[PDB]
Design a protein around this ligand. Structure first.
Ligand code: HEM
Ligand SMILES: *[C@@H]1O[C@H](CO)[C@@H](O[C@@H]2O[C@H](CO)[C@@H](O[C@H]3O[C@H](CO)[C@@H](O)[C@H](O)[C@@H]3O)[C@H](O)[C@H]2NC(C)=O)[C@H](O)[C@H]1NC(C)=O
Ligand SMILES: *[C@H]1O[C@H](CO)[C@@H](O[C@@H]2O[C@H](CO)[C@@H](O[C@H]3O[C@H](CO)[C@@H](O)[C@H](O)[C@@H]3O)[C@H](O)[C@H]2NC(C)=O)[C@H](O)[C@H]1NC(C)=O
Ligand SMILES: *[C@@H]1O[C@H](CO)[C@@H](O[C@@H]2O[C@H](CO)[C@@H](O)[C@H](O)[C@H]2NC(C)=O)[C@H](O)[C@H]1NC(C)=O
Ligand SMILES: *[C@@H]1O[C@H](CO)[C@@H](O[C@@H]2O[C@H](CO)[C@@H](O)[C@H](O)[C@H]2NC(C)=O)[C@H](O)[C@H]1NC(C)=O
Ligand SMILES: [Ca+2]
Length: 595
């Protein structure tokens, strides 16, 4: 399309023509186009954006303006009528550990983040959006439908603020509006080390030459590290309990403390980095801080890619895995490794996988304490239940032994997220993640469900009956049709999650295609991929092929009984074996042998 590169905000950096290691910003990965897959640049467009005004106004912005002849429904109205459900019985995934949902949030956070525009921290329009519900520039409030119980209780709307865009923060208008991805498009552990120089540094231990990551010296997990606290007012985690006053954590990714299993998850990764750094020092006492950092970073990064691609994607993609992620044929520099704007909605399938409760389990994998089980909604931004209630160990067993939620067409998203989500600075366990995913689609000019059906070489239902056949569900298809008035108009997040799941997968056909390409691209387009010939040695690669998320766990907690296959539904003590029976990451090949 006639124009060739805008994107003022991001300084260049004369590349690491040098570096044996990725950069923090992801720059210089690709040699001919060094900004490709760099953080802080526009999300990629697989298809052209679709805005009401053709440029930036989201569909649903002007009441009088229709999409394909019809008003689009209110996001919260789609949510109540289709996404919500009462009965949590019969909802669990007989074949998926809770670590399965947790891994996905983590991989997601390594890959993408479209922050809301910061355009007002000394502005009452920062609170004006919430207090008065006035659609209002970067303010695009989710209005409640007439028969919504939150009307009687919370007001007229749920605040919501349009996502930040490249080039102008403010007004400009000639080409379509493009949202930003602020993390690196590479599975590079950016969630552990950060995607800005700025935050990479603050995360590091530069007080010692061991190449360690900063740890919290304010509190400890039985001799085991905790992420450092965050720096900073005003704070989600102190607020949800002003008595414990326990801050949100600090990691390479800002949503680290969104919920306690992710912080947990973040906590396992930090430990692996330091435990990688102390041990590489052992073998190589001659290496300096930096060499220790990057080399650990580097090993940590391969780790994320193997567990994701060998253990995780096949149970997401199932029968479509081969069809989109053929086995690896090496680095291809012609591939675009940028996260697409539709992937950040596609990967939101994880939302139907989150169950309503989280448990903590003691060494016999039995309820740890009197209130061992807790509703997810009280764990939003809850750092205290970790520092002051058991360390991460009990929660990691909850991750091995409990189950994820199963997508279900009549039970899409649990009220804990749909009704009780806490949004920082909106003080009420009372928002709607479904509604918000739906408003966000529109915010990002997402093409509709069929556009994506066509794009994936699948059919495009047009009638009620047509949709019934595709969803294989009459009722969901009526609801759907009475809301949107056509297949054409259905928001992608929800039409994509509404189709039944492929043989041995957890997403339907459309999603396996959307997700499938993207992952193909981030692996094929990565100059530092783990199996890219020449990144790791012969030895190292044979040594890397054995990592397991049951290893991380043993090497980094005081858990001694674990799964062999952590993503599947695992019951103790039957499916739990001793830590000693599991292949280690042998670092012998990392000996910087002679001088
Ligand atoms: C609370 C939240 C979760 C768990 C209890 C949770 C979980 C996941 C899973 C398991 C994901 C994939 C496997 C996943 C993907 C993405 N999410 Fe979600 N998520 C919780 C809460 C949120 C909130 C809040 C948002 C922001 C919504 C907005 O649009 O304002 C959110 C988003 C996303 C997202 C887009 C990330 C981006 O690129 O900006 C995923 C890819 N999630 N989550
Ligand atoms: C905010 O976090 C507080 C902890 O930092 C938490 O208080 C703690 O929880 C209960 C009291 O409500 C107590 O835990 C157990 O132990 C005490 C003594 O050992 C027993 O007498 C109790 O029966 C209980 O089983 C802790 O004593 C208590 N700690 C403190 C400092 O009060 C609050 O509940 C949290 N509040 C919210 C709303 O999250
Ligand atoms: C549900 O959970 C499991 C997914 O984590 C699934 O495990 C794997 O299922 C597939 C398809 O049946 C098989 O895949 C494997 O088959 C060969 C056997 O020669 C393996 O060597 C390969 O690694 C390959 O991926 C496996 O049979 C199976 N896993 C293992 C370890 O072999 C379960 O079968 C599912 N169970 C139920 C009851 O739904
Ligand atoms: C940076 O590195 C050093 C090495 O770990 C840390 O200093 C140690 O701190 C722990 C706990 O206080 C103890 O083992 C000793 O007090 C110190 N020992 C040594 C050998 O230095 C320091 O805490 C680290 N700093 C941060 C912020 O992570
Ligand atoms: C690297 O990727 C590019 C595109 O992603 C591949 O170039 C393809 O070449 C075929 C010729 O048979 C052309 O039809 C297309 O221009 C390209 N195909 C696609 C899907 O874009 C190139 O082959 C890739 N290299 C390797 C080794 O896989
Ligand atoms: Ca990344």
């Amino acid at each position: 399309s006639w124009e060739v590169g805008c994107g003022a905000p991001v300084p260049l950096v004369k590349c690491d023509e040098n570096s044996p290691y990725r950069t923090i910003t992801g720059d210089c990965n690709n040699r001919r186009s060094p900004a490709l897959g760099a953080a802080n640049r526009a999300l990629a467009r697989w298809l052209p954006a679709e805005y009401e005004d053709g440029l930036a106004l989201p569909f649903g912005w002007t009441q009088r303006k229709t999409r394909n002849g019809f008003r689009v429904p209110l996001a919260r109205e789609v949510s109540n009528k289709i996404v919500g459900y009462l009965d949590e019985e019969g909802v669990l995934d007989q074949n998926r550990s809770l670590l399965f949902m947790q891994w996905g949030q983590i991989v997601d956070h390594d890959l993408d983040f479209a922050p809301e525009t910061e355009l007002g921290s000394n502005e009452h329009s920062k609170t004006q959006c919430e207090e008065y519900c006035i659609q209002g520039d970067n303010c695009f409030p989710i209005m409640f439908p007439k028969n919504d119980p939150k009307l009687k209780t919370q007001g007229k709307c749920m605040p919501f603020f349009r996502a930040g865009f490249v080039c102008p923060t403010p007004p400009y208008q000639s080409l379509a509006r493009e949202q930003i991805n602020a993390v690196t498009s590479f599975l590079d552990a950016s969630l552990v080390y950060g995607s800005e120089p700025s935050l990479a540094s603050r995360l590091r231990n530069l007080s010692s030459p061991l190449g360690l990551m900063a740890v919290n010296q304010e509190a400890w997990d039985h001799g085991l590290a905790y992420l450092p606290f965050n720096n900073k007012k005003p704070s989600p985690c102190e607020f949800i309990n002003t008595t414990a006053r326990v801050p949100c954590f600090l990691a390479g990714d800002f949503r680290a403390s969104e919920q306690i299993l992710l912080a947990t998850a973040h906590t396992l990764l930090l430990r692996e980095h330091n435990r990688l750094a102390r041990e590489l020092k052992k073998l190589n006492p001659h290496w300096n801080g930096e060499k220790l950092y990057q080399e650990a970073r580097k090993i940590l990064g391969a780790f994320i890619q193997i567990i994701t691609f060998r253990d995780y994607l096949p149970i997401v993609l199932g029968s479509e895995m081969q069809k989109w992620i053929p086995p690896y044929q090496g680095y291809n520099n012609s591939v675009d490794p940028r996260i697409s704007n539709v992937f950040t909605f596609a990967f939101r399938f994880g939302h139907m996988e989150v169950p309503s409760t989280v448990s903590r389990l003691d060494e016999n994998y039995q309820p740890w304490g009197p209130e061992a089980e807790l509703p997810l909604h009280t764990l939003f931004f809850n750092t205290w239940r970790i520092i002051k209630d058991g360390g991460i160990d009990p929660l990691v067993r909850g991750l091995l032994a409990k189950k994820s939620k199963l997508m279900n067409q009549d039970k899409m998203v649990t009220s804990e997220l749909r009704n009780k989500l806490f949004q920082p600075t909106h003080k009420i366990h009372g928002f709607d993640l479904a509604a918000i995913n739906l408003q966000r689609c529109r915010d990002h000019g997402m093409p509709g469900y069929n556009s994506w059906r066509g794009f994936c070489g699948l059919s495009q239902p047009k009638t009620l009956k047509g949709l019934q056949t595709v969803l294989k569900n009459k009722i969901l298809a009526k609801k759907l049709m009475d809301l949107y008035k056509t297949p054409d108009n259905i928001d992608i997040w929800i039409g994509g999650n509404a189709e039944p799941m492929v043989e041995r997968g957890r997403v339907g056909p459309l999603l396996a295609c959307l997700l499938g390409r993207q992952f193909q691209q981030i692996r094929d387009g990565d100059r530092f991929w783990w199996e890219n010939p020449g990144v790791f040695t012969e030895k190292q690669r044979d040594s890397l092929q054995k990592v397991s998320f049951s290893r991380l766990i043993c090497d980094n907690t005081h858990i001694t009984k674990v799964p062999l296959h952590a993503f599947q539904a695992n019951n103790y003590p039957h499916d739990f074996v001793d830590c000693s029976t599991v292949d280690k990451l042998d670092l012998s090949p990392w000996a910087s042998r002679e001088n």
